Design a protein around this ligand. Structure first.
Ligand code: FE
Ligand code: FE
Ligand code: FE
Ligand code: FE
Ligand code: MG
Ligand code: MG
Lengths: 172, 172, 172, 172
């Protein structure tokens, strides 16, 4: 047992290792999305910048959970990071829909981790999740929702004009 | 009944007075440890500075709990502050070991306080403990574990060289 | 065929996709090494900071290769990022030795990639590798060689004092 | 023979004179394109500025090859610069398609010059071409590819709205 370990359940420790894995997976998905928009036959530079930013943000989410593992005296165990679901993300609109789906998937994992922290009476871990993750997820899901609505109303993904102007005036 | 009192259980009020005493006791242990390192026959100036700083922080921890007691309309009752367990703290490593044990004792008190506040449906007091105390203890415990590990790996407490160099390069 | 593709062989395109995967794998190995040194029972903060920096550098290496794929009209295909060889990296000396081996493995792949680019008369890809990767690998291998030599000369990994002082005076 | 001449093959010298000619031709094509967009019945000011910039850039490409000729002790021989293929470039989209075609034509000449420098064991000339020209071509071809994709997706050249907005938001 770690000399620092106190009130930190084995199940919480393992669930934190599983969240770390999901944050690194989200980083990989956004990296994939970014360079799809960098393709010469897609060429939406602000979509590419937006998703790269999200990729770097997911990496920080993972690093902060790895800090928390060591803070509580848990032990980090890294697993393979699986490739994203697609190689080709089809359009601005479809990427944003897949991003919204991903962020609700990450949020569902965080809500399960909180349920577990709550059952194991770990108020420090509850506080960690609420302060650093739950509102970040709610804001990301709202922003991606806002983006999908606007691209739909503009006529995407049919209208290449819609995605071009959205890239310019919303993601620029 | 205080005109400000709302959703504040007498058991929570009582528990906050017991936490105030424990914080003041922690302040006193750290004061003792500081001036042990100031002895001409110990003479580790940065151990002494580190512990004096900890003593002053424990006093602020006490003062914020006395503020919370008044904010919620509880009444402060102060008790004798028991002298620390040692007069002579033996070595930089043994003081760090005792400081780690003390921060774990204070953390256990805070986790029983949060358990009580959760049982009494006091989300204001839960938030206060989470925001101001629980992560402070997790950082303090992790730092003290880090200090003990380094002192051990350097060959303390036998190696007088180890404590000297740790006093210069980590606590300086 | 991409409208931008010129003098870019299928084999080169595939070899760039394999190099992207190896860069991301290298990023992952350094992330693992960094948080090993962040453990309360290892507690070498400058080893942890040194390896986290290498981790972010490796991600930058991968991103520039993904940009290159798109610049030449190649198509990015991402694969599973396999977990690092180890969970516990044993010591600063042993981490540095494994880091040296990793950088030599990555160098070997870039040298094979340059052989292929040369054989396919792709001077643009030759230049890209030479300009952006080959001297980065030679400087990284020299630096890691230097670190290993010093840690060995100092008495690591038997001397916890060796690793502590190296952490302070070289990686600090 | 020039007193400075060393390891500089007659074929390399003549091929450099032929590249100089092709750079001056590219400058002329972009000059022609620029003033087409300056016409009162075309009136896309940012297309005109974009192509004028490219015209001045091609002139610098030519001047740098003329410096290199004299550096190596070769002798400059200028040939007629033939008029561009069109007087009327039809649209933003068609100009960008013709520019992409031109830049792949210049790139093909540079790759042939490199093959020749390689066969004649002229590492200085190889380095010259790789450092100053090959990545410039790859970047120009990617940018022009990106521009063609966006104008197509926007509905050009049918949509006068597409070319107007592209002139404003991408070339402005
Ligand atoms: Fe995340
Ligand atoms: Fe305290
Ligand atoms: Fe690398
Ligand atoms: Fe040119
Ligand atoms: Mg709560
Ligand atoms: Mg809170």
């Amino acid at each position: 047992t770690s000399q620092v370990r106190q009130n930190y359940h084995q199940d919480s420790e393992k669930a934190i290792n599983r969240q770390i894995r999901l944050e690194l997976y989200a980083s990989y998905v956004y990296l994939s999305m970014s360079y799809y928009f960098d393709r010469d036959d897609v060429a939406l530079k602000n979509f590419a910048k937006y998703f790269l930013h999200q990729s770097h943000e997911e990496r920080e989410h993972a690093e902060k959970l790895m800090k928390l593992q060591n803070q509580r005296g848990g032990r980090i165990f890294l697993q393979d990071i699986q490739k994203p679901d697609k190689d080709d993300w089809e359009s601005g609109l479809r990427a944003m829909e897949k991003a919204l789906k991903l962020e609700k998937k990450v949020n569902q994992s965080l809500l399960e981790l909180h349920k577990l922290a709550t059952k194991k009476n770990d108020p420090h871990l509850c506080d960690f999740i609420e302060t650093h993750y739950l509102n970040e997820q709610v804001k990301a899901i709202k922003e991606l929702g806002d983006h999908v609505t606007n691209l739909r109303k503009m006529g995407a993904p049919r209208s290449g004009l819609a995605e071009y102007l959205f890239d310019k005036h919303t993601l620029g």
